[PDB]
Amino acid sequence: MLDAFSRVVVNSDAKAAYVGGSDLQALKSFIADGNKRLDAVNSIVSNASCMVSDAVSGMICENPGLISPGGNCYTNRRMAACLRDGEIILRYVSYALLAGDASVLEDRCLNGLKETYIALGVPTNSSIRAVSIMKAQAVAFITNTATERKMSFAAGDCTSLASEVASYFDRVGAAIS
Amino acid sequence: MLDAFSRVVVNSDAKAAYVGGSDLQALKSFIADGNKRLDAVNSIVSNASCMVSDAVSGMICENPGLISPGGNCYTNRRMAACLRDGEIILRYVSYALLAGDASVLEDRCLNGLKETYIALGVPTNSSIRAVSIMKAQAVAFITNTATERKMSFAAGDCTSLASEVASYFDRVGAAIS
Amino acid sequence: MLDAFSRVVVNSDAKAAYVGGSDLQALKSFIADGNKRLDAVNSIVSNASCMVSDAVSGMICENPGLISPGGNCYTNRRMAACLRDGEIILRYVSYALLAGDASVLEDRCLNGLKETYIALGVPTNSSIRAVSIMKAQAVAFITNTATERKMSFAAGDCTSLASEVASYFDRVGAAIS
Amino acid sequence: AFSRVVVNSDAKAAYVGGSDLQALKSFIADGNKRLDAVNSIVSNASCMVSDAVSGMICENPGLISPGGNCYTNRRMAACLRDGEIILRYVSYALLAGDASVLEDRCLNGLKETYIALGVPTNSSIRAVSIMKAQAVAFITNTATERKMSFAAGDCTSLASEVASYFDRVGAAIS
Amino acid sequence: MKSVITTVVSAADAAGRFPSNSDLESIQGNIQRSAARLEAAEKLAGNHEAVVKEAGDACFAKYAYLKNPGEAGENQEKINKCYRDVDHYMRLVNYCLVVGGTGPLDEWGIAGAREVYRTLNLPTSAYVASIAYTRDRLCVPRDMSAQAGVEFSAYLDYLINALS
Amino acid sequence: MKSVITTVVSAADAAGRFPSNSDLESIQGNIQRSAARLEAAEKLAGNHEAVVKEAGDACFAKYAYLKNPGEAGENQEKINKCYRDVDHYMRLVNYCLVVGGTGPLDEWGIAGAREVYRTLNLPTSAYVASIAYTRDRLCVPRDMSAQAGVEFSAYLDYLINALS
Amino acid sequence: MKSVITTVVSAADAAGRFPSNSDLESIQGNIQRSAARLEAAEKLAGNHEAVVKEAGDACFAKYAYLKNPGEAGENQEKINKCYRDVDHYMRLVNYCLVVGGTGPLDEWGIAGAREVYRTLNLPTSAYVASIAYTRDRLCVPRDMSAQAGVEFSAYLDYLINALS
Amino acid sequence: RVAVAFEKIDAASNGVKANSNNKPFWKSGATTKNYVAPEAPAQSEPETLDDAAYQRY
Amino acid sequence: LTGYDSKSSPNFPNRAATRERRTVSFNARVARNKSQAKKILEKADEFFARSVTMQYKAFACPNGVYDIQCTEGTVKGAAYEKRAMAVSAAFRAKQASPAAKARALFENRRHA
Numbered sequence A, B, C: 001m002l003d004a005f006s007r008v009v010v011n012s013d014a015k016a017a018y019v020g021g022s023d024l025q026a027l028k029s030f031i032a033d034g035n036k037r038l039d040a041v042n043s044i045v046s047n048a049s050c051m052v053s054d055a056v057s058g059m060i061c062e063n064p065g066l067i068s069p070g071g072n073c074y075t076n077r078r079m080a081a082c083l084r085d086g087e088i089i090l091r092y093v094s095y096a097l098l099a100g101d102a103s104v105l106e107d108r109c110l111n112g113l114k115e116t117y118i119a120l121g122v123p124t125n126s127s128i129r130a131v132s133i134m135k136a137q138a139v140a141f142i143t144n145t146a147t148e149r150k151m152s153f154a155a156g157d158c159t160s161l162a163s164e165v166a167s168y169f170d171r172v173g174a175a176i177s
Numbered sequence D: 001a002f003s004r005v006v007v008n009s010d011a012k013a014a015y016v017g018g019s020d021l022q023a024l025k026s027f028i029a030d031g032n033k034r035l036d037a038v039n040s041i042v043s044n045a046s047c048m049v050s051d052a053v054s055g056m057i058c059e060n061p062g063l064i065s066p067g068g069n070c071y072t073n074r075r076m077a078a079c080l081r082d083g084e085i086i087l088r089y090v091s092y093a094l095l096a097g098d099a100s101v102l103e104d105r106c107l108n109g110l111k112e113t114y115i116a117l118g119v120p121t122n123s124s125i126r127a128v129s130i131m132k133a134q135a136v137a138f139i140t141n142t143a144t145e146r147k148m149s150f151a152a153g154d155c156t157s158l159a160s161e162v163a164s165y166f167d168r169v170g171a172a173i174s
Numbered sequence E, F, G: 001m002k003s004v005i006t007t008v009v010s011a012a013d014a015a016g017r018f019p020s021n022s023d024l025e026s027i028q029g030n031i032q033r034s035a036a037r038l039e040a041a042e043k044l045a046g047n048h049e050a051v052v053k054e055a056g057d058a059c060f061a062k063y064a065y066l067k068n069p070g071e072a073g074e075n076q077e078k079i080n081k082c083y084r085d086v087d088h089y090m091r092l093v094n095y096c097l098v099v100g101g102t103g104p105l106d107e108w109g110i111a112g113a114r115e116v117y118r119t120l121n122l123p124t125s126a127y128v129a130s131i132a133y134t135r136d137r138l139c140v141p142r143d144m145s146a147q148a149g150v151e152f153s154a155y156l157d158y159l160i161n162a163l164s
Numbered sequence H: 001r002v003a004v005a006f007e008k009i010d011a012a013s014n015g016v017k018a019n020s021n022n023k024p025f026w027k028s029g030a031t032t033k034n035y036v037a038p039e040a041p042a043q044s045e046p047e048t049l050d051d052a053a054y055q056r057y
Numbered sequence I: 001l002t003g004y005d006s007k008s009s010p011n012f013p014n015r016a017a018t019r020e021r022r023t024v025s026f027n028a029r030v031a032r033n034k035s036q037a038k039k040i041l042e043k044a045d046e047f048f049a050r051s052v053t054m055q056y057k058a059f060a061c062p063n064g065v066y067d068i069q070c071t072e073g074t075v076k077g078a079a080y081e082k083r084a085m086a087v088s089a090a091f092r093a094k095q096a097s098p099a100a101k102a103r104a105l106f107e108n109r110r111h112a
Ligand SMILES: C=CC1=C(C)[C@@H](Cc2[nH]c(/C=C3N=C(/C=C4\NC(=O)[C@H](C)[C@H]4CC)C(C)=C\3CCC(=O)O)c(CCC(=O)O)c2C)NC1=O
Pocket: A056, A072, A073, A077, A078, A079, A081, A082, A083, A085, A086, A088, A089, A108, A109, A113, A120, A122, A123, A126, A127, A130, I047, I048, I051
């Protein structure tokens, strides 16, 4: 759809004005910490399958009435589709982080999700618990803060990205709540 | 709306013909077994306070994820709304058994109930089970076959009525599905 | 209906956890900047009637076809409604700045506002123009940059509220799109 | 023979007000320095126990492997709980100026409990020694990534005092 | 919810008007109490499993009939559901201190409690025996601050008045 | 549900036709086979707890390495899940005998079981070693007929050649 | 195959336009890793002959029951095959880190991998013990710079997130 | 103000707190039926079978 | 039992008279509380129509590279006319005959 570099253009087309020093230096601050950004998306894709394997197991261990019949993770086909539902919503967050703007997940992933989860009988609050762990799993990896696994980077701060994906995982959560 | 007497009236009005003396024999046994049907509506409505109570508490002990937080029976406002959601359903079944027809619940209770639960996000797999529990408690009360309570009746067998209320508690579970 | 204090207990109810000291320090920082918020809400509601007079009359002067015969502000009837279609928005925005959470206008102002305008034929370039104008004014009043209206506050920083109210107006523009 | 706060199960708070602090601040020599050395630790108590037990993993990665002790994420959190409690009594021991409550309530029997549960003692000696080497730099304000705002002077007396408390922890589990 | 922010924004919304000067004096009084109320929420958040253990069995020490066949504490697993039933009410008192108002009690814990506890045959007098014990087993300087124990006790009387 | 009744009506529905008498021959084969198939399921409903315990003891006898840490049997709560994981199979084997087809098995238990077992590091080599012990020590004249010992044992190795 | 060049040359043809100036910007980014990634390829190509042993011996320490009779490593010649097996996966990381993408792996290594392991009963969780041992072995001061440590360690984490 | 306080203090690591052994009794208990794992017998590790040659027999 | 009685909710559909009322008041009373689930299951199946058309393009783009099957253009701007012809006819097929409406429905519920 459109990244952040083309988000500043489409806000400016209504202004019908050229792009100059009024709106360029935030994009200059994008590039000047651009090496930090794709240094952070490396340590999500590198350990993404262990995240959701812990996120859905952490979802069921809190509410064990999801595997009982009547819960929506009873069947193996109810539990196989739980991973791929819980993998696409992580995959769409990784597009918003790389492109910088959250325009990709709000329409190709979230437009029509609230209406389908209450059509299929999917429990809403169980998914919102699962995506909140993936919010916590991300910010423990952008900043090397997770206990059992860390990796070596260049010495610096990355709290702008760790507050960005926390703004990316609740717009998923507010689309379902 | 339409009882068992006015059921054969509207069927005879498709022919626009007089209701003869050859088709009221199905009605005269329904009169002659009418004292059994008054004897059986009194069996249900005299212990309806525990039929609805035992059904919802039995729905919870099989699917415990309805009281884990975010659940559909989580707060006291959700639970007390369920215990009247579950006894208005019994209020129309006890109407339908007395009239000897299904015209009072398929037009005043279930016409429009399927779209209501998917609006509020209610799960149907739980709401089926609370109905089918109340079905098995009614046929244990129509016949004198309950475990904890027995009542005083005359000698005979009412398996025609016990098969009738089973035919009323499953048109519930198929309409909401 | 949901301020900044109650979003924390809404978030902590899905965990079924007591609000620990880890989350109260972000909520103590809301109280510590509490006088800057009341020094910022007053900077908008005290000259609010001039803001919506400036935004509507500023929108029509960069697009003179909006009052031309066949435009959306042709008669006095369409002009009196345009002046209150805009000031209903700015009234509900300041509720979300006074509370700290957008859960007032996304539940009482913006839901169904998209479907309302497309039936009337209200143009979408002009609805987000007047709220891109009122976004430029609201960041010009909370920070003292208004050229002919210098209200006096203490010395300090208000760039944090310069991002909070500026996120609401392009969240309305994402809703009337 | 532990300390003057002997009170067990009554309230548990015991703050000190302002004028009674003036009866205390005119009663400790370098009591202004001792309060800043406590506040340079207890403002940074979360980062101290996080960097210590990760640096223990960063020198000994065999505790994340299955069979290791800091597998099964409760037990990593129990090591994070035990890293806090070793820090909070030594941050009390800098405040009180003694290790009497530390040797009676925290360090007493700590050798026999850790060999009862199968806790590796040599790794935990490395964990306190990282927490020893941090708090020296926090008190003398030679902490690299974050510098506090203190008044001018020296605090090398208290930095030698807090290393004596951390060596008592390393002696008690050796 | 019912708090100080939701109350002045509702009466603003129920009268079609901007936030006035009286709508900001009220939230000024939220600043003068948050530093005397959030430390009551701090103490309850770290000491709940010890205050719910002793307040839960203060009702079983008072009403000992509940451990009979046919009663509400028949087996062991229905005793454990009662400790879960009481550890919800201390959790919502903690949420009313954080929000400031009594919204989380009378919308998640009070609303519908009469219909539930009449249906399932649960005596509310044993609920208010477990909540009046906590309100009385409390020293003002020992357990809390001087005014944090006024906030915490002002919500423990909202439960007892609502269940009676 | 993939039963013989469904397979002959689905081809009847796809051709736009009526129920022809060619399908009626297959319904006649049910009532001959149904008596020698239901008592395989009736004896399974009265023996399920004693057979599911005796199955999992050969799962840990053939592969005793799962008690190591990092495996799927290091603590008691998931060894309890191992008996629940294998009871759910031997309930769906009971469910498919009553239907007569393989309907409940390949839809509920099987479809989607591959991509979650390698996901959670569960081998299927220990899953098939649980039922192959069950399928072997069962004497065909001693427990049930010579026909149910053929038909029911034809359902247990259906799992093994779908999992391997 | 997947690379920086062949991916972006596809959308020029698959949308039917010319080579743009944005795809010309993409090969420029391949120059910034051309002298930054290829040092790891010549590193391991002269280094595998000793790390095929210590990472081949790495999994059997975790799984000593493969050498047990009966299973997939029951004889010595199977283990002669097993060391040749693991010398095809990082034989492709010499092919992957020389091209710039996962091309030699997503079309030759994972395509059909889970289907030849279920039928031939090879436990996929031992390859997680085979080459991720080299991830826990890698020294950025001694062996090679931290640019291989961010790119050679990345391509391995592609594979464990594929064989699981 | 000095303001010491003695209270029970723990930490967490991404899904679980530290004091989950001694939970309160209402928080856990009676969730599922319990199995028992049997005794897994530990045998020795073997050799090989070279010959790529007896394996078809 | 809950209260002194259990009456039905006024939020339940089909609760008013609709006997001798005006046309404006007839249509307001038959669609009383049914408008929500009609629009819930309208964005439901449109998301299903958007979801399986994505899951089959993954075969069309195997492991992140486009094949010769996509090829929407051959000359300069050869997709702009293909853009119009695919979306203008999609409106042309939405103004079809009322016999072909359910003929599309019941045959899609045959072959699938
Ligand atoms: C474009 C973006 C996109 C998505 C967001 C998902 C959305 C989505 N989910 C499911 C479908 C589903 N999704 C789940 C998942 C879950 N249910 C739960 O109770 C848990 C909260 C969660 C697992 C953690 C389940 C159980 C089904 C049902 C599958 C079925 O019908 O058998 C379906 C199709 C219906 C089906 O599978 O039969 C779709 C399209 N798929 C997409 O293509």
